[PDB]
Amino acid sequence: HVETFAFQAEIAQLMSLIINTFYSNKEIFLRELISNSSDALDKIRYESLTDPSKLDSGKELHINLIPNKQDRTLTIVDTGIGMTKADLINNLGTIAKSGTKAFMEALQAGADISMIGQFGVGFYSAYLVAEKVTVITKHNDDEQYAWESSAGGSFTVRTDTGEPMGRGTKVILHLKEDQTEYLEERRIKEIVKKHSQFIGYPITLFVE
Numbered sequence: 001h002v003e004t005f006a007f008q009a010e011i012a013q014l015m016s017l018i019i020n021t022f023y024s025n026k027e028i029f030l031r032e033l034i035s036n037s038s039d040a041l042d043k044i045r046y047e048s049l050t051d052p053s054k055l056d057s058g059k060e061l062h063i064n065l066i067p068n069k070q071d072r073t074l075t076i077v078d079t080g081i082g083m084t085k086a087d088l089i090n091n092l093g094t095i096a097k098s099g100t101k102a103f104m105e106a107l108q109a110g111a112d113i114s115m116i117g118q119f120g121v122g123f124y125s126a127y128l129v130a131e132k133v134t135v136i137t138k139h140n141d142d143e144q145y146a147w148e149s150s151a152g153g154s155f156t157v158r159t160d161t162g163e164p165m166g167r168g169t170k171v172i173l174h175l176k177e178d179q180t181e182y183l184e185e186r187r188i189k190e191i192v193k194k195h196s197q198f199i200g201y202p203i204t205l206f207v208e
C-alpha cells in the first residue's frame with residue numbers, strides 16, 4: 001500500500017518558492033544532492049570504524065550519476081547510510097522545519113537560492129529542475145522504501161519492490177521538459193567540475 005502524507009506548511013511553502021521564483025542559476029541542484037550523498041557516505045564510514053559489519057550491505061563508498069533520456073530522469077545514487085522509515089516520515093520534516101525558517105529569513109537580507117545548502121534543506125533545490133522526485137533508500141536497520149513527491153503539498157512513502165540496492169539512497173529526478181540539458185554528458189561534467197570537484201568519494205558519470 002501507498003501512504004500519503006502532508007508536508008508541514010513551511011516545507012510546502014519552501015517548495016512553492018523554489019518552483020515559483022524566477023531564478024536562472026538552476027544547476028546548483030546537482031551539488032546539493034552530491035553534497036547530501038557525501039554527508040551520508042561520511043556517516044556510514046564513521047559508523048563502520050567501530051562496527052565493520054555495518055558494511056555487510058556493501059563496502060564500496062561511492063556516488064553514481066545516471067542519465068536516461070528515454071525516461072527523462074537524472075539519478076544520483078549513493079551507497080551512504082540510507083534513510084529509515086522514521087527519517088522519511090518524521091525526522092526529515094523536523095530537520096527541514098527549522099532549516100526552512102532560517103533559509104526563508106536569510107533570503108530577506110538578500111541571500112539567494114544558491115545558499116540553500118547552508119540550511120540543511122538543499123534537497124528541495126531538486127524542484128528547480130524536476131517536476132517529480134522519487135527517492136529510493138535503504139538503511140541497514142530497515143526496509144527499502146520509495147518516497148515521492150510532485151510537490152503540491154504532499155508526498156507518498158511505500159515499501160519498494162524494485163531491485164534491492166544493498167544500502168544507500170537514489171534520488172531520481174523526473175526532469176521538466178525544458179531541463180533536459182541535465183541529461184547531457186558535457187553539461188553534467190561541466191557542473192560537477194565547477195561545484196563538486198573535491199568530494200571525498202568516486203563519482204562515476206554513467207554514459208547512455
Ligand SMILES: C#CCCCn1c(Cc2cc(OC)ccc2OC)nc2c(N)nc(F)nc21
Pocket residue numbers: 036037040078080081082083087091092095096120121122123124135147168169
Ligand atoms: C535524516 C536526515 C538528514 C539527511 C537526509 N538526506 C538527504 C536530504 C533529504 C532527503 C530527502 O529525501 C526524500 C528529503 C529531504 C532531505 O533534506 C532535508 N539526502 C540524503 C542521502 N543521500 N542519504 C541519506 F542517508 N540521507 C539523506
